[PDB]
Amino acid sequence: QDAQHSFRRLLKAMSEPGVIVALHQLKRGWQPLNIATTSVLLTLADNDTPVWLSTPLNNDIVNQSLRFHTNAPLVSQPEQATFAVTDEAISSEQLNALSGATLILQVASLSGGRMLRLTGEERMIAPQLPECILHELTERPHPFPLGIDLILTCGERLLAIPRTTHVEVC
Ligand code: NA
Ligand code: NA
Ligand code: NA
Ligand code: NA
């Protein structure tokens, strides 16, 4: 798909938190970045938006792909990120460093986790998330607009949970 396609689908996901959309702006992701993360980065990042990749996703091939296709500054630490890309090993420390940034969290499934109710009319989803991310979403310790916007990606699919969404467990 073209870039405009990616932009519209990402808008839709952001507009309707928890709805899953598919983005496929190239045939393969810059592995281990999935196709949705890669497409989000092609869509939003450029020379003005530093990107920080956590250690598991930070390798020379990923860095080279991202530099060539986006020219975003690839920063060594989360405190300077406009876009953070991690997997579910993201630590509480790194999360707190991102308050805020947009966190593209790669997950190995968008289902099969603890049930969440999203409001802000409700939507139910159940992605698998690390406890630090669940805490952030359910407690919202940082006043608007200091916290992260979250984009969860898996394969070519994604859903968004903007910082303004209310999230509950139960
Ligand atoms: Na929106
Ligand atoms: Na790993
Ligand atoms: Na941004
Ligand atoms: Na989990």
From Swiss-Prot:
Ranges in coiled-coil conformation: none
Keywords for this protein: Transferase
GO molecular function per UniProt: alpha-D-ribose 1-methylphosphonate 5-triphosphate synthase activity; identical protein binding; protein homodimerization activity
Listed transmembrane segments: none
One GO term of the biological process aspect: organic phosphonate catabolic process
Keyword Transferase among record annotations: yes
Protein name: Alpha-D-ribose 1-methylphosphonate 5-triphosphate synthase subunit PhnH
Source organism of this protein record: Escherichia coli (strain K12)
